[PDB]
């Protein structure tokens, strides 16, 4: 009365741990995972405001070039 | 006969002569102006290229300081 | 005695062609002259205008600049 | 005797729990070698990138720069 009865409150404190414990791993890979997605997709973003630059580059050179022709 | 005769002959080559004098001062004016509103325009041109500038600048900080974050 | 009322009958035709001319070219230069007044309003607002962009455009410039060296230092820790 | 079948009862529960927390710390440690590894490919891309952006951006700067000492010097003839 004890031995598969403290070997129950043992057999499920173990299943229970085999839970909260995945969990953390679940837990700490999703984070990560989506962490670095979000870098990724700050790469991305980056380099259409580097576009949106170049046109603004080459758009001040054409009215400078011409402030220079009068 | 030669006397608004050539006082014909001169009397016209009045007129004509205040005609394509009147176009070169035309002409010289109309030049300046058209010149000087094409820079004006070129000013305001210019100033909406940097409002997109200053756009970029700020979706940079933006994407950099996330960098950093992280 | 009369190509003396007649001569001066043709000296007011080119005497008249040639003040045109002077008085076109006096109030052509006057307009210059205002042209180049406007001229110069429009130099001095753009002077005026292109430092506050200098300074703004610097100002992004040097934070740029800023947050790039901590990324790169960040990579070196 | 018996708490000798009895023991190795209790102790392949604690001897089951303990090796799920070790498989489970393998498995990770090994997506974390796997997420440094992708990490550094993110890295070299972005640095690789810098440096074609550095440059354009250089060059456009440096054009901008030349026509605004063309203007300024323009202004002092």
């Given at each position: 009365d004890?031995?598969?009865q403290e070997?129950?409150?043992?057999s499920q404190e173990a299943n229970t741990?085999?839970?909260q414990n995945q969990k953390d791993?679940?837990?700490?890979m999703n984070q990560q995972?989506?962490?670095m997605q979000q870098i990724r997709n700050t790469v991305y973003e980056r380099e259409l405001t580097h576009r949106k630059m170049k046109d603004a580059?080459?758009?001040e050179i054409k009215h400078?070039?011409?402030?220079l022709e009068q």
């Open positions: 004890a031995i598969r070997f129950l409150q043992v741990y085999r839970l791993y679940d837990f700490k995972l989506a962490e580059y080459e758009e400078l070039k011409l402030g």
